[PDB]
Write a protein that holds these residues in place. Sequence first.
Motif, PDB file in Angstrom:
ATOM      1  N   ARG A 161       0.813  -1.209   0.000  1.00  0.00           N
ATOM      2  CA  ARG A 161       0.000   0.000   0.000  1.00  0.00           C
ATOM      3  C   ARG A 161       0.851   1.265   0.000  1.00  0.00           C
ATOM      4  O   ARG A 161       0.444   2.297   0.543  1.00  0.00           O
ATOM      5  N   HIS A 162       2.035   1.202  -0.598  1.00  0.00           N
ATOM      6  CA  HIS A 162       2.872   2.383  -0.701  1.00  0.00           C
ATOM      7  C   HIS A 162       2.281   3.352  -1.722  1.00  0.00           C
ATOM      8  O   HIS A 162       1.847   2.928  -2.801  1.00  0.00           O
ATOM      9  N   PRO A 163       2.247   4.650  -1.417  1.00  0.00           N
ATOM     10  CA  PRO A 163       1.750   5.623  -2.403  1.00  0.00           C
ATOM     11  C   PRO A 163       2.532   5.619  -3.702  1.00  0.00           C
ATOM     12  O   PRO A 163       2.055   6.173  -4.701  1.00  0.00           O
ATOM     13  N   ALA A 164       3.724   5.023  -3.720  1.00  0.00           N
ATOM     14  CA  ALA A 164       4.441   4.808  -4.969  1.00  0.00           C
ATOM     15  C   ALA A 164       4.034   3.512  -5.656  1.00  0.00           C
ATOM     16  O   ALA A 164       4.089   3.437  -6.890  1.00  0.00           O
ATOM     17  N   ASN A 165       3.612   2.504  -4.898  1.00  0.00           N
ATOM     18  CA  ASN A 165       3.219   1.206  -5.426  1.00  0.00           C
ATOM     19  C   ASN A 165       1.800   1.267  -5.976  1.00  0.00           C
ATOM     20  O   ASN A 165       1.121   2.294  -5.908  1.00  0.00           O
ATOM     21  N   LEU A 221      14.046   0.400  -8.392  1.00  0.00           N
ATOM     22  CA  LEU A 221      14.987   1.486  -8.153  1.00  0.00           C
ATOM     23  C   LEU A 221      15.385   2.189  -9.442  1.00  0.00           C
ATOM     24  O   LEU A 221      15.790   3.355  -9.404  1.00  0.00           O
ATOM     25  N   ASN A 222      15.284   1.509 -10.585  1.00  0.00           N
ATOM     26  CA  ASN A 222      15.523   2.186 -11.853  1.00  0.00           C
ATOM     27  C   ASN A 222      14.477   3.265 -12.103  1.00  0.00           C
ATOM     28  O   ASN A 222      14.772   4.287 -12.731  1.00  0.00           O
ATOM     29  N   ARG A 223      13.256   3.058 -11.613  1.00  0.00           N
ATOM     30  CA  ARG A 223      12.216   4.066 -11.767  1.00  0.00           C
ATOM     31  C   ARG A 223      12.364   5.189 -10.752  1.00  0.00           C
ATOM     32  O   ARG A 223      11.966   6.326 -11.030  1.00  0.00           O
ATOM     33  N   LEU A 224      12.938   4.900  -9.584  1.00  0.00           N
ATOM     34  CA  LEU A 224      13.125   5.936  -8.574  1.00  0.00           C
ATOM     35  C   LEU A 224      14.317   6.825  -8.908  1.00  0.00           C
ATOM     36  O   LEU A 224      14.216   8.055  -8.864  1.00  0.00           O
ATOM     37  N   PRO A 284       2.863  10.747  -8.184  1.00  0.00           N
ATOM     38  CA  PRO A 284       3.111  11.759  -7.144  1.00  0.00           C
ATOM     39  C   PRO A 284       3.680  11.168  -5.867  1.00  0.00           C
ATOM     40  O   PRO A 284       4.535  11.795  -5.227  1.00  0.00           O
ATOM     41  N   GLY A 285       3.225   9.976  -5.474  1.00  0.00           N
ATOM     42  CA  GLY A 285       3.845   9.292  -4.352  1.00  0.00           C
ATOM     43  C   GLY A 285       5.305   8.981  -4.606  1.00  0.00           C
ATOM     44  O   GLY A 285       6.146   9.123  -3.713  1.00  0.00           O
ATOM     45  N   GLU A 286       5.628   8.556  -5.831  1.00  0.00           N
ATOM     46  CA  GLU A 286       7.022   8.375  -6.209  1.00  0.00           C
ATOM     47  C   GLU A 286       7.806   9.664  -6.024  1.00  0.00           C
ATOM     48  O   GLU A 286       8.912   9.657  -5.471  1.00  0.00           O
ATOM     49  N   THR A 308      11.753  12.809  -3.030  1.00  0.00           N
ATOM     50  CA  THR A 308      12.112  14.090  -2.433  1.00  0.00           C
ATOM     51  C   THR A 308      12.501  13.936  -0.968  1.00  0.00           C
ATOM     52  O   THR A 308      13.511  14.496  -0.525  1.00  0.00           O
ATOM     53  N   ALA A 309      11.715  13.181  -0.200  1.00  0.00           N
ATOM     54  CA  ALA A 309      12.050  12.962   1.205  1.00  0.00           C
ATOM     55  C   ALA A 309      13.365  12.207   1.342  1.00  0.00           C
ATOM     56  O   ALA A 309      14.174  12.507   2.233  1.00  0.00           O
TER      57      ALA A 309
END
Lengths: 139, 78, 78, 217, 139, 217, 78, 139, 78, 139
Positions: free
Chosen positions: J80-84, J94-97, J117-119, J124-125
């Motif tokens: 349930r990660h806002p990036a997932n 990690l290639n996408r991050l 946006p979660g990504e 950023t954090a």
Amino acid sequence: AWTPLEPKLITRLADTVRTKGLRSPITMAEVEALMSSPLLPHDVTNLMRVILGPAPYALWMDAWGVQLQTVIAAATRDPRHPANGQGRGERTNLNRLKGLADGMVGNPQGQAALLRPGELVAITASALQAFREVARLAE
Amino acid sequence: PWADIMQGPSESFVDFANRLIKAVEGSDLPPSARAPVIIDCFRQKSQPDIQQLIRTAPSTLTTPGEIIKYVLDRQKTA
Amino acid sequence: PWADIMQGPSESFVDFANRLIKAVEGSDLPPSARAPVIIDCFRQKSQPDIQQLIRTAPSTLTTPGEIIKYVLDRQKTA
Amino acid sequence: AWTPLEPKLITRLADTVRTKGLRSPITMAEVEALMSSPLLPHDVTNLMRVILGPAPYALWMDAWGVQLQTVIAAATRDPRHPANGQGRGERTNLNRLKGLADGMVGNPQGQAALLRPGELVAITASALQAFREVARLAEPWADIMQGPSESFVDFANRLIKAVEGSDLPPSARAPVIIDCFRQKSQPDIQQLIRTAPSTLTTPGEIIKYVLDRQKTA
Amino acid sequence: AWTPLEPKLITRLADTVRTKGLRSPITMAEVEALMSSPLLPHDVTNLMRVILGPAPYALWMDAWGVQLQTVIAAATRDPRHPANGQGRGERTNLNRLKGLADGMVGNPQGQAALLRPGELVAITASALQAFREVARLAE
Amino acid sequence: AWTPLEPKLITRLADTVRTKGLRSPITMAEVEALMSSPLLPHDVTNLMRVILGPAPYALWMDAWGVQLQTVIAAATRDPRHPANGQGRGERTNLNRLKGLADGMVGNPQGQAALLRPGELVAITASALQAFREVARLAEPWADIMQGPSESFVDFANRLIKAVEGSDLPPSARAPVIIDCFRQKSQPDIQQLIRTAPSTLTTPGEIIKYVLDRQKTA
Amino acid sequence: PWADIMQGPSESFVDFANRLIKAVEGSDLPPSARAPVIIDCFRQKSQPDIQQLIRTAPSTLTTPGEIIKYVLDRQKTA
Amino acid sequence: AWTPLEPKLITRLADTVRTKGLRSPITMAEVEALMSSPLLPHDVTNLMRVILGPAPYALWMDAWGVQLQTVIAAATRDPRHPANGQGRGERTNLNRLKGLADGMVGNPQGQAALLRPGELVAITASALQAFREVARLAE
Amino acid sequence: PWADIMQGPSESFVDFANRLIKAVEGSDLPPSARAPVIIDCFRQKSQPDIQQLIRTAPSTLTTPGEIIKYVLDRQKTA
Amino acid sequence: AWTPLEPKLITRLADTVRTKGLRSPITMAEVEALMSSPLLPHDVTNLMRVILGPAPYALWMDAWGVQLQTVIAAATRDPRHPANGQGRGERTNLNRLKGLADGMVGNPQGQAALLRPGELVAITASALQAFREVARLAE
């Protein structure tokens, strides 16, 4: 029948050992003289008890035992020993050589009865070699 | 007295052994106690050269005759 | 001459043994008389420290090699 | 049912550790005595908290953790551990060994309830080995010489002490002690050992020989 | 189940050995007292480690080994040793006597498990005789 | 058919033993070289007669006899020795090993005739081990200190030489060399080794570390 | 006061560690703040020889026990 | 059949190392020359014992062990090593590489018997790389 | 020139690292050869105190950033 | 649509970092200011390239990678990660991050297209925490 050695000859031999020592050729000749007839273990034992001091007598008992053990090894290595017989019932144990066997302990008559002439000559040669060893060792 | 016999500084070893065996066998000990006493007197008397000679015996000597033979073999000729 | 060989006061024991064995084997003795002569020359030559070292041998040494090994083991490092 | 160790025995053991130290054989014997019955993690933890100072206690916690981890590696290497069971549901985690598992944290009664006897003996042996390590760590043989005026038994005592209380393997102590007797131990005793008609192959035999033939002075 | 000896008794015995010495009759009596119940090799080894100094401890290890070897020679000379069994599979090796066998090294519980009472009493008598020898030797 | 070894090789080996000694690794390598093909008792006996002096030759005869006796004990302990046969009539006596048996005394041709290849290789290995023993015997680590002016590589060379050419077991040399580096090797290098952020568990690693961080002077 | 504890010029390290751990654990800090404070006091107190000894640690020491063990191993024997 | 290297070549190489040093290109060429045929662990070990001093020999033993360990890691990372076999029973342990395995300790003949040619060339290359490392390190 | 860059006796390590990385990245080397060169220049330049500090690294440092972090952690504050 | 940060603000921030340093609270406040809107990997990467020197930039790349790896571990620990996403096809590599995935390398427009946006907020954090670590480490 057992006949003892003369105490006169034994006294003369003891004084010879006392003045000339154990290693003189005259002393060895005298011992060979008194070692002429095959002696019973009783005779040789008492002879060495009288002519030798306490410490040489202990050394001589040791050496005589060792030489008799070599003789018994040669005897078990050859069934034709003049002390042995043909069957296994005549095999000669060290109790019979040292005079410790049954019917012999302390009794020279019974000793002379049961012993063989080959036994006697082997005991005598063993005692002579032991005397030679102890004489070479004492001085 | 056997327990008072010491080997003198100048005395040979065969004389000491003769004297000791004489005094031990001509004493009031039982016959079965003479050999151990003679051995233990050879070891504690018989001034420290022969004491160390008997102590450093690679073989175990279990008879006065054997001890006498060993000492006569390896004694310091002097 | 083998019977004139002595171990010098400063000489090591292996040099003395080499010299003695050389002179005894390169001499007029029979082949069966070299080992006893070498042994008895080790015992009577080889200055009194090694003489006493060989005398007080708890074992009986009956070969020149065994005597050499024993002496090399127990020799006084100096 | 859990029964605590007597504070009298613990006080006596603490004073023993205070006067004799951590490494004395009497102290190790006393610890073995109080380590006789299988203890719960609570017991051993409080015992080491009381008898050991702060820094030795930190060292002991470290060493105990390492030894317990070795035990758990051996346990995952053999499903027949007396702490383990046959199925996978009895596998023993380090939280259960250190007393950190559920129903055990701070409660010795629940601890004694859920723990196995094999668990207890493994924890106890681990704690004993850790104590040995820390004692060997908390407090040089090749620099020991026999003084000109020192006797030989004192020199032998000092040398054997320093050699056995060192980092050598157990199978290398006797040869080192012998070769140190031969090269140390000032040249009179050196020559006394050198000219030994017999071959001395043990420190006890060398000590006996030297004590016999030593120059009384 | 193994129970250790009291460190209080061991401390008192160590101070006794320190003040009276190794050879006093009171010290030997105290050792006989603490040598009453059959001890495991671990117990006797730690006891001698604590009460004896380093050099007497080395001497005692030597003497204990020699006495245990004599015991094992007598054991191979008689299959009815209280440490032995009837079959050959119960023959007792020196690794089992000195506590060096498998399952015993460093573990007193396993030691007490596998050892026999005859083994324990033989080890104990051997250790007592070794202590006597070392005490007679030290002074 | 028996072929003798070249007297040129034997002369070169004798001069090698004369200049380098008995224990040098080059001498042992040369002996291993001339010990390549299985030699008959005659060959090894004459070889040791020529290359060794009289006293080392006596010592070598003794040691060779002892090693051959150990071999014959192992042979009577295993009827599958490459020198033995299957029946009892092929059991190998010491008279056959030392070349004293019937048809062999003084005759190398008959020797080569009756001897087995297993016999030859056993005799050869025995002679090599005896040579090693005598070389170690013919010519103190705990007394070695690093002099105030001596460099560290010289001290390490001397110490490793004296430790490896001594009576220690092979498995006790590295710990002794390490603990002698730590306690000898005057207090500057002692403190240099003590304050090692890494744990040094080998003499080579200690030598490398000290050579890196040594005080250039 | 824990923040006033220094290792004396002649004091050993185990005594300093004992004193510091005592004063830190017997103080008003939360339980979760004692280990970091003990570590950072080992690093800044404990006179510059041990300071440099801890600084040049090829491994990262993250516990007072590990720091104590490391320092006891590599300390300058004197 | 094992044949030893000539002590004449070894003596010449030792004197070369003594005069020119460990790092000269002529010395490395000479080592490559005497490193031509695949040597058994016995040969290389004795060669480095003779040509190198004590401290360089210790360093070389260390480096040789490390390089052999890297080789064994690559071998367990590839079952097609010329030292390995196809089945798991031919996997090569460091005891077999350093000559410490069973039937090899101290015996060069048995060594040459059990060793593989791939084993020999791997040992040889490892020893050469270790010599290079130690030479770069010594000076 | 990158191969002529040395860390001065008084220069800090971050300045030396900045200068070296600048000169190595602004040079004629391929992009895939900059990191190994920067590492091997950190190891051989960077005067012997930091040289020994990098040499005795219990971990293997395989990146200029990791080397910089390690050196900044364990550097001799002065 | 991607809009770049003003080079005037970036120049002012670079001079702030140059005069005040990395650790001053004013510098961290300015970084938080320029870290207000969620930035694409391109933006943060170029920003740190400009404001940081070479060695701090290397340190920051390392720290950013480590923090992003911790984020991806937490992401695989929680679907349930806002990036997932909910299915497995939206899992974020990690290639996408780091901006290394397909369609993103060097192109900020495509980056802004595919990123969530979660990504962006996670990146950023992570970058902010890495900057804090490097600032605490540099001085």
